[PDB]
Structure formats: C-alpha cells, structure tokens
C-alpha cells in the first residue's frame, strides 16, 4: 500500500528568466511590459479641446483658423502637426516659452483692453492674407494702426491698460516691419518711428526695419494693480483684448484621431496607453500617469511553479 505526493504540470510551459537561469520553464507566466497601444486619443471623462488646424499661440492673437478656440475651459488641450498660428508673415519672440505656457493651462478667457485712438489714426486695417467671412480681415485680438490719409505722419499717441482682476494677464502686441520705404511712408509717413513699452515688470524699445511685409509679435505678463504703457508714432499692432490663462491642464501633441468612447491617463505621439502593466516600450516621450519606459521587448513574470513534464 502506497500514497504518493506530487504536483501538477502542463504540456506547454512558458520560459522565464530567474537570477540563476535564463531558460527556466514554468507552468504559467504573464507579461509586464506593454508593446501595443490604441491608435486613438481616449478622452472620456475629460473636458477636452482638439485644436485641429489651430496653433495655441493663434488662439491668443485670434488667427482665422482659431476662431472656434478664442475662449474656453478645459483639462486637456490637444495640439496637432502643421498647425496655423500666423495668417500674416512673421513669428513671436520667445515663441516656445509661450506655447508651453498655453499648453500647460486649463483654459483661456479674454478681457477687453478698452483704449481708443485719434481720428487721424485708422485702427481697422485688414489684409488678403488673413481672410474671414469671404472678405479681408485681421487677427481678431489685435488692431493694425495706420494713418487715415496716405502719406500723413502717424500721431504720437500713448495707450495705457491697468490690471484690476486680482490675477496676472497675458498681453500681446505686434511690430510691423515694412517691405519697402514707399510702403512705410504710405502707412506711417516720413517721420522716424519709435515704439516704447513700459511697465513695472517689463521695459523695452522697438523700431521697424525696411526690407509682402511681416509682423513680429512680443508678449509679457501684467501683474495685478500694475499698469503697462504703450507710446508709439507708427508701427505698433496694438491689442484689443488681453488674455487670462486659467489654472492647469494636460497638453498633448499627437497625430492620432479622437475617441470619446473610452478613458485613458497616458498619451504619446501615436495615441493612448491603457495598460495596467507597470512597464512599456512604445515611447520614452509620454504625458500623464504612465507606465515607465524600458529597453525591453518582453519581461515575463512567473505565476506558477517550475514545469517538469512526463
């Protein structure tokens, strides 16, 4: 009479690595590194904004492509490739610092600056490069200031905006750099041009060059209580409304389509990552609450004993 002790086995066992053995067969194992992702942005439970054709800077200056994104609140802002920031030739100074600041935010709201100009100054300047509703137009949040009569000198004028919202406001203005001298003389006259921007925080001077044209943008933060003074005699593209960035939000840069029928907390250029697994080998560049990137195709965790068949 005999009683035997023993353990189970399986026909096909999986190979795992131990401290002492690279080829160790076990009854069962499970993967710890994820190597597949959804080719889609999973936005369920997220007040999100897909900018599409709009570039984040364009939503502060009011580019035609950004008309639907001048204002809003969000917890997720999604930027796309080849997005339009400028309808008229030019670029913003300290550009990347601004884009980061907007993509970090959780919403945007406009506050009207209010200031007006003299009767000799035309503040309704438009262009064929910046189309809106069929006809010519301009950056919605700024005004192109030119002389009302062609050739007449642009008046020496001083505009000032005070901050009274208990929170810092982002203000943007542009400087026109004419193509030829005749163009410069047509808009602002023969006089020597000089634009001064002055606050407690910010202080700088700008001068148009001569060499169709372009408009460079500049920006700074006006603190609560403090004023900012613009004195100018032609060349300034002055703001109509300043901006207020609200709170905090998750910026995503991706080409993948949106999907509002599922949830995720981790994103990369190619989509979302929905795994419960601790590690991942899709990309080192990820955003949100993610599994950590590793240089490994697979790491098998044994969930069963050593397999000793037949």
């Amino acid at each position: 009479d005999k009683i035997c002790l023993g353990h189970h086995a399986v026909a096909n066992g999986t190979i795992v690595k131990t401290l002492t053995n690279e080829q160790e067969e076990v009854t069962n194992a499970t993967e710890t590194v994820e190597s597949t992702s959804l080719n889609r942005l999973c936005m369920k439970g997220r007040n999100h904004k897909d900018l599409g054709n709009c570039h984040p800077i364009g939503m502060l200056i009011g580019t035609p492509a950004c008309d639907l994104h001048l204002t809003g609140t969000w917890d997720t802002l999604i930027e796309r490739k080849n997005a339009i920031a400028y309808c008229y030739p030019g670029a913003t100074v300290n550009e990347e610092a601004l884009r980061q600041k907007i993509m970090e935010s959780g919403g945007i709201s406009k506050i009207n600056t209010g200031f007006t100009y003299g009767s000799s100054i035309n503040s309704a300047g438009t262009t064929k490069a910046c189309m809106r509703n069929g006809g010519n137009s301009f950056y919605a949040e700024l005004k192109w200031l030119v002389s009302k009569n062609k050739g007449q000198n642009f008046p020496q004028t001083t505009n000032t905006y005070r901050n009274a919202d208990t929170a810092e406001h982002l203000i943007m203005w542009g400087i026109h750099h004419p193509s030829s001298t005749q163009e410069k003389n047509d808009l602002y006259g023969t006089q020597s041009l000089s634009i001064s921007v002055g606050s407690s925080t910010y202080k700088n001077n700008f001068v148009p060059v001569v060499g169709l044209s372009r408009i460079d943008f500049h920006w700074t933060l006006v603190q609560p209580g403090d004023k900012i003074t613009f004195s100018h005699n032609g060349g300034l593209i002055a703001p109509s409304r300043v901006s207020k960035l609200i709170g905090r939000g998750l910026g995503i840069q991706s080409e993948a389509p949106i999907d509002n029928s599922c949830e995720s907390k981790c994103f990369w250029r190619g989509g979302s990552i929905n795994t419960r697994l601790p590690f991942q080998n899709l990309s080192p560049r990820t955003v949100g609450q993610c599994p950590k990137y590793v240089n490994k195709k697979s790491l098998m965790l044994a969930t069963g004993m050593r397999n000793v068949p037949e």
């Binding site: 002790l5 023993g6 250029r269 069963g304």
Partner: protein
C-alpha cells in the same frame, strides 16, 4: 531547487492533475485514486496573487511634456534632456529586469517549499506506520482503504489505530 522536492526527489509533475497544484495519488487493494490538496494549492496561489497586486501597478505621478513633438528646442538643453531620459530609462530597465528575475526565483522556490511542507506534514501524520521510498511516496505497512487514505488527506489519521499491525509488517 532550494527545497529539493519539485524538480528534486519528486521526479516530475502530473499532467493528469487539473483540479489543483499539489495533491495525492494512492494505490491500495481496491485500486487507485487521485485528489488535490486545497490548503497547499491556495497558499501558493494567494502568495502569487499578492505579487501581482504589488507588481502590476503604476505610479500616480503626473508628467507633463518637456520635449516638443513638432517645434525644435535648443541643442544644449535637448542633449541635457536626452541624457537625463536615457539615464532614467537605464535605471528602470535594470530595476525591471532585476525585479522580475528576483520574483521568479522566489515564486519557483516558494512553490517548491509548499510541496515540501505538505510532504513533511504527511510524514509526521503517518509516524511509524510508513516509510519513505525516496521518490515522494510513502509505503504504508498496513491495509489502508479509501477512507484510511481520505483521513491522511483530511489530516484526521490516527497512527495509534494501525501501529501494532504496522511494526509487525515493517520488522517482519
């Protein structure tokens, strides 16, 4: 392995036993039987479940972008970010490779230990009524029917009831 049972004195596993991880196979006058042991099986499963709960997880830390996907960045600070990310990756790759290798080694040896603890428990139940054959089995020196075998598995075997019959057969 460490505890010398699985891939040790027990020559191989049983593909036939699908209802448990560890168990018994007996032979008597009546014939043969098989039965899984719940206690030892569940101890091995619960410990493995415990590992999965700790390991199959992520941190709740929010990470925002620093590399721009579409626009470019200064070449110096770009290299500082590339150096930092590669350094952190090499750490996580190392820690991941180490973790899994350490845990697998522990899982294999833990499963071996539960096998031995069952074996030792049965050896002490049987006391002087049986002898070890060296291959995981006990040769019981008295007629042990299915109910006697059931009590060995259920841990209700009284060695006193069969002792005098056993010692006579053992000594011969």
């Amino acid at each position: 392995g460490l505890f010398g049972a699985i891939a040790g004195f027990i020559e191989n596993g049983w593909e036939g036993m699908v209802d448990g991880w560890y168990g018994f196979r007996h032979q008597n006058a009546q014939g043969t039987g098989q039965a899984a042991d719940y206690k030892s099986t569940q101890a091995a499963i619960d410990q493995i479940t415990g590992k999965l709960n700790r390991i199959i997880k992520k941190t709740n830390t929010e990470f925002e972008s620093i590399e721009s996907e579409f626009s470019e960045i200064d070449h110096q600070i770009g290299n500082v970010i590339n150096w930092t990310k590669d350094s952190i990756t090499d750490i996580w790759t190392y820690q991941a490779e180490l973790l899994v290798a350490m845990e697998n080694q522990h899982t294999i040896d833990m499963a071996d230990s539960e096998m031995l603890n069952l074996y030792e428990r049965v050896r002490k139940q049987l006391r002087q009524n049986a002898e070890e054959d060296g291959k995981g089995c006990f040769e019981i020196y008295h007629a042990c029917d299915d109910s006697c075998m059931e009590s060995i598995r259920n841990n209700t075997y009284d060695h006193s009831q069969y002792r005098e019959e056993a010692l006579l057969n053992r000594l011969n």
